[PDB]
């Protein structure tokens, strides 16, 4: 990987972020993108500011310049797609910060684990192309074959891990270079385990395992910590519905357009197209958001909050409020 030139760096540094509190649950990344003509610069800045503010790269020997380089190396690896672009991962990062620090989830983990989660947010969908794992396996693409012959159906996640390891293997972008022995090993391993757990095919099993561990007073402690990390990155990944309605709506539009584009390609190549990806059906956004809420996100947040993450109660409340708003849209249709 080519090095991060100083103007690249300096450009991110000049962003000022006035009128924004990045630690707030109502922080609005869409507004931040619109507030200047270099949104990719402002996004980077939000991440940088989040990490320095936590107090954590400092404690694990990661300097500010390495921190920036890492972010910028991650950024160059994000494509221009509607949803799975760099803003999604910065959003996941900032959202995770709120879970740890407004939701008190920090109490369940070590400082290193908190540091790892914030970093892992930025790598977790590196080089995403707007196409889901299913696409690669249907069209027998190289990545699909490679994953399949390697023994792992989590096509993109193994890909994102491979690239995260490749970025951290360069010392000018190694945010974990100041760690040693068991700590270094733990950061790599937990980072990887977290990104592999974002595959939604494993959603049910990762949720059941966390729940089972949280209910058991004699759970292996190390194991509980890992699963809590995995669940928190999962939580950030499906956190669009826990945000203020207008934000949530904006995310929904973006993911919908990405899904549609995949469907367009699937038609071209002749493979099977599901209705959710079919632009020639035009379901309403509301129904699609209500279904995601009822089948995936409300039970997930409700369950983890009740199991042991009591501080995240606002996620359940906002999901409830967002659902009602979507119902209201349909009720006055
Ligand atoms: C803003 O609104 C959204 C944001 C993200 C997604 C995602 N969706 N999925 C899938 C999840 C399982 N899916 C569903 N499962 C079940 N049981 N019910 C239902 S109802 C409708 C869907 C559905 C299909 C999509 C992904 O894997 C993406 C990659 C990683 C994390 C979340 C991403 C989806 C959004 O809104 C639909
Ligand atoms: Mg992903
Ligand atoms: Zn993601």
From TrEMBL:
Residues 5-333 form the PDEase domain. Mg(2+) 2 binds at residues 125, 157. The active site is at 84 (proton donor). Zn(2+) binds at residues 88, 124-125, 237. Mg(2+) 1 binds at residue 125. AMP binds at residues 84-88, 125, 237, 289. Zn(2+) 1 binds at residues 88, 124-125, 237. Zn(2+) 2 binds at residue 125. Belongs to the cyclic nucleotide phosphodiesterase family. This is Phosphodiesterase. The gene is PDEB1. The chain holds residues 586 to 918 of 930 of the full protein.
């Amino acid at each position: 990987v080519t090095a991060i030139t100083k103007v690249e760096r300096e450009a991110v540094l000049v962003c000022e972020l006035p009128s924004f509190d990045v630690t707030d649950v109502e922080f609005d990344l869409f507004r931040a993108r619109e507030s200047t003509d270099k949104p990719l610069d402002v996004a980077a800045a939000i991440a940088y500011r989040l990490l320095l503010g936590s107090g954590l790269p400092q404690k694990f020997g990661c300097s500010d310049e390495v921190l920036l380089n890492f972010i910028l190396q991650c950024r160059k690896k994000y494509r221009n797609v509607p949803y799975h672009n760099f803003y999604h991962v910065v959003d996941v990062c900032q959202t995770i910060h709120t879970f740890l620090y407004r939701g008190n989830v920090y109490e369940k983990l070590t400082e290193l684990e908190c540091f790892v989660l914030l970093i892992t947010a930025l790598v977790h969908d590196l080089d995403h192309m707007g196409l889901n794992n299913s696409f690669y396996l249907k069209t027998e693409s190289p990545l699909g074959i490679l994953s399949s012959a390697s023994g792992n159906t989590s096509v993109l996640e193994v890909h994102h891990c491979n690239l995260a390891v490749e970025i951290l293997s360069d010392p000018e972008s190694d945010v974990f270079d100041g760690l040693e022995g068991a700590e270094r090993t733990l950061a790599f391993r937990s980072m990887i385990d977290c990104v592999l757990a974002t595959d939604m095919a494993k959603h049910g099993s990762a949720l059941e395992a966390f729940l089972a561990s949280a209910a058991d007073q004699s759970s292996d402690e190390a194991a509980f910590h890992r699963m809590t990390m995995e669940i928190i990155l999962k939580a950030g990944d499906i956190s669009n519905v826990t945000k203020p309605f207008d934000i949530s709506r904006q995310w929904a539009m973006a993911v919908t357009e990405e899904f549609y584009r995949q469907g367009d390609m699937e038609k071209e190549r002749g493979v099977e197209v599901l209705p959710m990806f079919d632009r020639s059906k035009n379901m309403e956004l509301a129904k699609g958001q209500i279904g995601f809420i009822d089948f995936v996100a409300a039970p997930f947040f409700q369950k983890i909050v009740d199991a042991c993450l009591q501080g995240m109660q606002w996620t359940v409340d906002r999901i409830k409020s967002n659902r009602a708003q979507w119902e209201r849209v349909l009720e006055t249709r």
